Structure formats: structure tokens, C-alpha cells
Design a protein around this nucleic acid. Structure first.
Lengths: 52, 188, 166, 166, 205
RNA sequence: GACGGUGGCCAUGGAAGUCGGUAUCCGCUAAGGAGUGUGUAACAACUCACCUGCCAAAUGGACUAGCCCUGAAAAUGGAUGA
């Protein structure tokens, strides 16, 4: 119930590949940036998880 | 490039009636009436009878070819909406402040007072045709409903994006109203 | 070549600036190696130490070694104040689940001894470190764990460090 | 080998990791014993009740307690006893250091050890049992005189001992 | 090209045509939910008497064997173009194969999108619903009613069969509760002969 | 669907496919790595390789060189000459 909510939240914010030459937030299947500043590129990393 | 496209067909149920004039359709169904324009080159968009609407493209580029399918999909969506409407269930969540949402169907608007302890009454008008209704399961959801998917989704988006603190860490909080079930359609 | 070999280095404009800095660096280094505040064995900041060393008065030298000079500095303040020229020993009380990470930070940093690990009981370790390092130790456990960490002295002091006289 | 017995009366299930000499360095899991009502020392004892001398580390052995007392339990893994009896000595002082398995005849041991874990494992008994357990321990060999899965593929041993342990 | 790839298909062809004329009787079973733990107990009883041999959609590579036998593939009951199948072979025990196959079934809750067995009852009523799980019910678009002093969506009858996908919500409900609707494993569709059908009738016993 | 021997053998609070060391084979199979990560004191649970159902004709990849985009920041206002 509560975990579901958390996962939903993550879905739109946290689970997105976050580029590198750019820092554009994309989507978990990404292999490009869709930015003509980034030059599309193929430097996608995951967006990091929470840490205290 | 310039390969000659085939047709893209979309089925039409006997519940609805699809008009078309000057490359610009109009579905009419029990629920209401959606209208949409499509502007392209040599895109013959015709009716076979009252069972199939066809979209064509004589000598399409790859770009041109791509958009045909999109057009078809959009008309399918329209068809769907005007016979059995779209329903987006949105769940809202934050880990301390209870987010106070309340609908006003007179204004056709959702308003959110609390969400991060923000004393503003964050509101935005729903798009033309669509409405929300205050559905309860434990004070956790709001269910938007509509004919047009395009409008409905936009409405959802507006209240999603607004409902989010825009300062410091995005992972730490869960603040927002997010779309849970979007594939569901209102029952008839 | 001859000049390079047998001659001594002379300060140009840039080098003059460096010279000024050098003294500051030396004092920072040499003084902050070994000391504790009077009354009990606790860690304390470098500024205080510097002040203390100024009160008694000290002149650093590039002709002497830094390590050598450290001993000299401590000599002055062993007579004047109560200070710690040697190591101390600590005892931490770690949880079983959350402590592993902590341990891995500490292990390459300083020498671990008396390492008693249990599942049913809490993990216990003991360290060998200088008097100024306690603060460093305790701090890094708390932010990594995200809870409070119990700091206890195994001994108030122990031999070696600058007490063996290197 | 103790006699194979079923659970009866009160049933306290335990998972002992070692059992040749039980806890030397607390090699038994110290959480599992006290959780099921059994002290650490007590647990050490009953580790050796299941397999006194054949007990190795990383075991799948079940130490059951009928009325919180040993019923001379057997059930242990095939892999343990088999490995154990190649080079017989298995305590906890020879199992803290690396060791090579003996190259001695082991065909009659595997058939008994095959169904020591359970009566039916849902696999082919009398047909390819020696093919399975002759190379379960890939390092070394079962017996150097013969070849695993060449002179032991057609050659099988047991008929009542292969389906039920002694 | 053909007869290639990882873990070759050509190899499987040998099993599905040459060993399809070395048995007296057969049974066409259904494997769309049974596991490997459940199924390996039905590869001991069956293996001793015959075998379980099928490459899966290799009945169309059987047409060379149908020259003499004249075997039905699309003509028999179930055309096998909507469900997975695994043909059971037997020669020693032709009578004691139809019931021992059903003895090894194991019951469990339904899964998300599974093809599902014959019988699938959804949880409902006081036993089939909790008071804490009413929120979930409320969330759903379908109506909730008070039957027998408990808030429920009310359905305690068969709404799906073999080859019809269970709903997600229903599956979730099943998983949450301790309700196991039906015991399932390898379920016979029909009894099968060499070049014919012996009995075109289901036998779950 | 992703199993049995099995938590293989090493080592140890605990490392049980999944901190890490070395071998890495067989059963039952259409097929299932002594295992790709998430996770857990370690497990469990989830995920992948692997295999198959549904659908139905093309599909996947590693390169090559054309134009185009990124790389591509400077001071009066502005230069394919407009």
C-alpha cells in the first residue's frame, strides 16, 4: 500500500538514466539524450539512489 | 525515401459515427464529440463505409511515413474515448504532511492546499471536456475521467508537476500526485 | 652544471612568496602531530596548539627535519603543560548489521586489535592511534551509520608514537 | 552413523554449520541456537550428536530435538560425509587450513550418502548415482585407480542401500 | 538459416519424429503453469513407463512420419494454436498413466496474466476478504457491496477457463490471501493414439 | 518455467547461486550458469542467462562514407557582398 506509493514516486523521479555530457533526465531504456547540445551521445548513467 | 506507403486502417464500431472533411476528422459517439485536424502532404484520409477509416500516403519519406501511424493511433484514441471514456486514477503521497486535495466541478478544477506544508492553495483548471471526482479509498486518490485522452493526460501532468517540491533532494521526498492507473476506461 | 651541483638555491620573486608560506606550513605540520589539552586525554584543534607554542615561543627551521622538530616542540610543552606525546587506545561498540561498513573504513586507516566479533552480541574492536585522531575516528562512524556511536577509552595512553623518539 | 529418525513430540529445528568439533572460533551460527531455545554451549554439543566426526563446514544438516533432547538424529548432506571420508580426520583444527582429499575407494559410501539427506530426492537412483557423486567434488578425484563417469557409468552399486541409508 | 542457433533446434527434431512411433498409447497434457519442482515428480513415474517427449511446435515436423500412420495434429480436439502442450508417452502402463499424472498436482494462488487452469474461484465474503484490504477494493472501478457483513466485490464462481488470462487485481487478491482456488500440474486435454484419438474426452481424475 | 545432487569444495560472528578463492560435473529435461544484478548478519523473496507458448515475415549486429547535428567562447552593429 505504502510501498506501492513509494515505487510510483520513484517511477517518475528516481529511476531515470541521467546522461553525462548534459545531465538531462531521460528514461530507464535510454541510449541517447535527445538534446542538440549534448549531441545525443551514448553516455548514459543511472541516477543514483538515496544515501544519508 | 519515396517508397509508396500502404494504407493504415482503423476499425470503427457501430456505436460511433466518424465524419471527415478536408483532412480533418470528427468522431461522434454516445459519450460526446471529439474533433481533430491533421495537416500533411498527399495524405488521403477516407472512409470505406462505416466500418473502416483509411489513412494513406503516396510516396512518403521516412518522416512522412512515420506520422501516418501516429495519425491512425490518434483517431483510434478518439474513437475509444467517444464510446468508452478514459479514466486516469491518480494517487497522492507524502510521508508526513497530509496533502489536502478537493475538487470543484463548478470551476472544473482541483485545488491542493497542503503538500509540503506550503500554505499556497495550488490549483489548476482541468482541460475542456474532462472532469475529476473525489473518489475515496482511505483519502488516497483522485480519479480523472474524460473523452479525450490527450486533454485528460495533460490535466494529470499539470497537477503532477505542480505537486512537487523544487528545492534540494528529489529522492528523499515522495511528495506529489502521480498517475497510477491510466490504461483503465470508465465502465458502460 | 657546476653552479647547479655545488651552489645553493636563491629565492626569486615567486620563491619569496613560497618562503613566506613555508614557515606557516611548517608550524601547521610540526606542532599538530602530538598533543592533548591539560586535564584528561582528549583531542583538540590545531589553532590552540599553535597558540600554546607561540606563548612558549618556537622558531622553525628548514635545515632541521620536521619529525625532529616535532620532538623539540613537544619537549617545551611537556615541561609547561600536561600533554600526550604517545598513542592512545580506543574501544568501539559496533552493531552486527550496520558495523561492517564502519569497520572497512577504519581497518586501512589505523591498526585494529582485540577484534571480538559476534552475531548474538554486539561487535567489539580496539584501536591504536594518536591523541588527535580520536575525533577523526568517532566522527566518521556516526555519519556513515546514521546513528550514535559509543566512544570509550581502552587506555588513556599507550607507548610508542613520539615517545619511542624517532 | 546414528539411526535415521523422524520428527516427533516437540520439534525444534536447527541449522548447524559445522560439527566435526563444533564451535572453536564460534563457527556455529550463534543467532540460530538461542532463537530456538538452546544455549551456545548446548548447541555445540548437539552439533556433534548429528555427525560427531564427519561434520564439515557449510552443512545442510538438521539437528532435531524431541522434548528438547537429542533423538540420535542422522539426516545430513551427501557432500559432507563423502568429502569427510576422503582423508578421514575432520574436526575444526584441520578445517581452519586447506587440505587435499584422499584418492581412495569411495563407491560404497556414495550410495548410502545419496539418500542420507532424504529418502526420495526426485532423481534417478541406481543408474547414475556414482556419476553424480563421483564428480560432486570436482577438485581431486573420487578414486585414482578408476575413472569417474567411464568405468563408473555402467558400473553401479546398491539396491536397498541406494534408496535408503543405513 | 535453418537447424542452427544456440542449443540447436535440429537436435530436437530427432526426438519429436523418430520416437513418435515407438509407443502404444499417448496423452496430450497441458503445461502452462506447473513448475520444475512439481514437474520432476512426473518425470520419474512417466519416465519409468515411457517418456515425456516434445520439442514444442514440432508436430509440423512430424509430417514425414504421418505418411504411414496418418496422425492428427490440427484435426484432433484442441488444435494446439492457442496453448502450450507436452505429449506424454507410455507403453508399460497404459491404464495407470491417466491418474498418476494428476496425483502429482500442487495447489497455489494465481499469477499475473497466467493462462490459468480449468477452475479459478476469486476470493470473496468474510473468509475471502479482510477488513484492512477494503482500501484495495475501493480503489478498483468495479462496485463494492456489503455481503454477509463484509465489504466485497462479490464473485465466488468460475469466470475463466484454460487459455483465458486472469485479471491482475484478481491475481493480487489471490496472492494476498490464503485462498488456493484449484490444484494443478500436468492436466490431460485428451487421450491419444498412434494415428488416431483413443478418447476425445477430458480426464482430470 | 528458470529444478535435483547442493548450502559442491575453500575460508568465517555471518557469506547458504549473488563480499571474496578455485574447480565448474552429473541427474531430470523443451530448458534451466555450482549463477547477471536488487536484496538479506547469511538466507528467503525478486531479477537475468537459458528454454518455450501467443502473434506471423522478416529480423539483429559491426563497420563504411555522403550531407546534417554536437564538439564550436570576445569585445561598436553585421556580413554567402546585400
Amino acid at each position: 500500500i505504502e510501498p506501492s506509493l513509494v515505487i510510483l514516486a520513484r517511477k517518475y523521479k528516481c529511476d531515470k538514466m541521467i546522461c553525462r555530457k548534459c545531465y538531462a533526465r531521460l528514461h530507464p531504456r535510454a541510449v541517447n539524450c535527445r538534446k542538440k547540445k549534448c549531441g545525443h551521445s551514448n553516455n548514459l548513467r543511472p541516477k543514483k539512489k538515496l544515501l544519508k | 525515401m519515396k517508397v509508396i506507403n500502404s494504407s493504415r486502417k482503423v476499425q470503427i464500431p457501430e456505436n460511433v459515427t466518424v465524419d471527415v472533411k478536408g483532412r480533418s476528422v470528427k468522431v461522434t459517439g454516445p459519450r460526446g464529440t471529439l474533433s481533430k485536424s491533421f495537416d500533411h502532404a498527399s495524405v488521403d484520409i477516407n472512409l470505406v463505409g462505416k466500418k473502416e477509416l483509411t489513412v494513406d500516403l503516396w510516396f512518403g519519406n521516412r518522416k512522412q511515413i512515420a506520422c501516418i501511424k501516429t495519425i491512425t493511433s490518434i483517431i483510434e484514441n478518439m474513437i475509444t474515448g467517444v464510446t468508452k471514456g478514459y479514466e486516469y486514477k491518480m494517487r497522492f503521497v507524502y510521508a508526513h504532511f497530509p496533502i489536502n486535495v478537493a475538487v470543484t466541478d463548478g470551476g472544473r478544477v482541483v485545488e491542493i492546499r497542503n503538500f509540503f506544508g506550503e500554505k499556497i492553495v495550488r490549483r489548476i483548471e482541468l482541460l475542456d471536456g474532462i472532469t475529476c471526482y473525489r473518489n475515496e479509498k482511505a483519502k488516497d486518490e483522485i480519479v480523472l475521467t474524460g473523452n479525450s485522452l490527450e486533454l485528460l493526460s495533460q490535466s494529470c501532468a499539470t497537477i503532477q508537476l505542480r505537486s512537487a517540491i523544487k528545492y534540494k533532494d528529489v529522492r528523499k521526498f515522495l511528495d506529489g500526485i502521480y498517475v497510477s492507473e491510466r490504461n483503465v476506461l470508465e465502465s458502460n | 652544471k657546476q653552479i647547479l651541483t655545488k651552489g645553493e638555491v636563491q629565492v626569486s620573486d615567486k620563491e619569496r612568496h613560497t618562503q613566506l608560506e613555508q614557515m606557516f606550513r611548517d608550524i601547521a605540520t610540526i606542532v599538530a602531530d602530538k598533543c592533548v589539552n591539560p586535564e584528561t586525554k582528549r583531542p583538540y584543534t590545531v589553532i590552540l596548539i599553535e597558540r600554546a607554542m607561540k606563548d612558549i615561543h618556537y622558531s622553525v627551521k628548514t635545515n632541521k627535519s620536521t619529525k625532529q622538530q616535532a620532538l623539540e616542540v613537544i619537549k617545551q610543552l611537556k615541561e609547561k603543560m600536561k600533554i600526550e606525546r604517545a598513542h592512545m587506545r580506543l574501544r568501539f561498540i559496533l552493531p552486527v548489521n550496520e558495523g561492517k561498513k564502519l569497520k572497512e573504513k577504519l581497518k586501512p586507516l589505523i591498526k585494529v586489535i582485540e577484534s571480538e566479533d559476534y552475531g548474538q552480541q554486539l561487535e567489539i574492536v580496539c584501536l591504536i592511534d594518536p591523541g588527535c585522531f580520536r575525533e577523526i575516528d568517532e566522527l566518521i562512524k556516526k555519519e556513515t551509520k546514521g546513528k550514535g556511536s559509543l566512544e570509550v577509552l581502552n587506555l588513556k595512553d599507550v607507548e610508542e608514537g613520539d615517545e619511542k623518539f624517532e | 552413523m546414528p539411526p535415521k529418525v523422524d520428527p516427533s513430540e516437540k520439534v525444534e529445528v536447527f541449522l548447524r554449520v559445522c560439527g566435526g568439533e563444533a564451535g572453536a572460533m564460534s563457527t556455529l551460527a550463534p543467532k540460530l541456537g538461542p532463537l530456538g531455545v538452546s544455549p551456545k554451549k548446548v548447541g555445540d554439543d548437539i552439533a556433534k550428536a548429528t555427525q560427531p566426526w564427519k561434520g564439515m563446514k557449510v552443512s545442510v544438516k538438521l539437528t532435531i530435538q524431541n522434548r528438547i533432547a537429542v533423538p540420535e538424529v542422522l539426516p545430513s548432506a551427501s557432500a559432507l560425509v563423502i568429502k569427510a571420508l576422503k582423508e578421514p580426520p575432520r574436526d575444526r583444527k584441520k578445517e581452519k587450513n586447506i587440505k587435499h582429499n584422499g584418492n581412495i575407494p569411495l563407491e560404497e559410501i556414495c550410495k548410502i550418502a545419496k539418500t542420507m539427506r532424504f529418502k526420495s530426492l526426485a532423481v534417478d537412483f541406481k543408474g547414475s548415482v556414482l556419476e553424480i557423486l563421483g564428480t560432486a567434488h570436482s577438485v581431486g578425484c573420487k578414486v585414482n585407480g578408476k575413472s569417474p563417469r567411464d568405468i563408473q557409468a555402467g558400473i553401479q552399486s546398491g539396491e536397498i542401500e541406494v534408496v535408503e541409508p543405513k | 538459416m535453418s537447424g542452427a542457433g544456440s542449443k540447436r533446434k535440429n537436435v530436437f527434431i530427432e526426438k519429436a519424429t523418430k520416437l513418435f512411433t515407438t509407443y502404444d498409447k499417448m496423452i496430450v497434457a497441458e503445461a502452462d503453469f506447473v513448475g520444475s519442482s512439481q514437474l520432476q515428480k512426473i518425470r520419474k513415474s512417466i519416465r519409468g513407463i515411457g517418456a515425456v517427449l516434445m520439442g514444442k511446435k514440432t508436430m509440423i515436423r512430424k509430417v514425414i512420419r504421418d505418411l504411414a500412420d496418418s496422425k492428427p495434429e490440427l484435426d484432433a480436439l484442441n488444435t494446439y494454436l492457442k496453448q502450450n502442450t507436452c505429449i506424454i508417452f507410455c507403453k508399460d502402463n497404459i491404464a495407470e498413466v491417466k491418474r498418476v499424472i494428476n496425483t502429482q498436482r500442487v495447489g497455489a494462488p494465481a499469477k499475473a496474466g497466467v493462462f490459468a487452469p480449468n477452475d479459478v474461484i476469486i476470493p470473496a465474503g468474510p473468509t475471502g476478504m479482510e477488513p484492512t484490504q477494503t482500501s484495495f477494493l475501493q480503489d478498483l472501478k468495479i462496485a463494492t457491496k456489503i455481503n454477509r457483513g463484509q465489504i466485497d466485490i462479490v464473485n465466488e464462481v468460475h469466470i475463466i477457463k484454460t487459455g483465458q488470462k486472469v485479471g491482475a487485481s484478481e491475481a493480487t487478491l489471490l496472492q494476498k490471501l490464503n485462498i488456493k482456488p484449484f490444484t494443478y500440474g500436468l492436466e490431460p486435454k485428451i487421450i491419444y493414439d498412434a494415428g488416431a484419438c483413443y478418447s476425445p474426452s477430458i480426464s482430470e481424475e
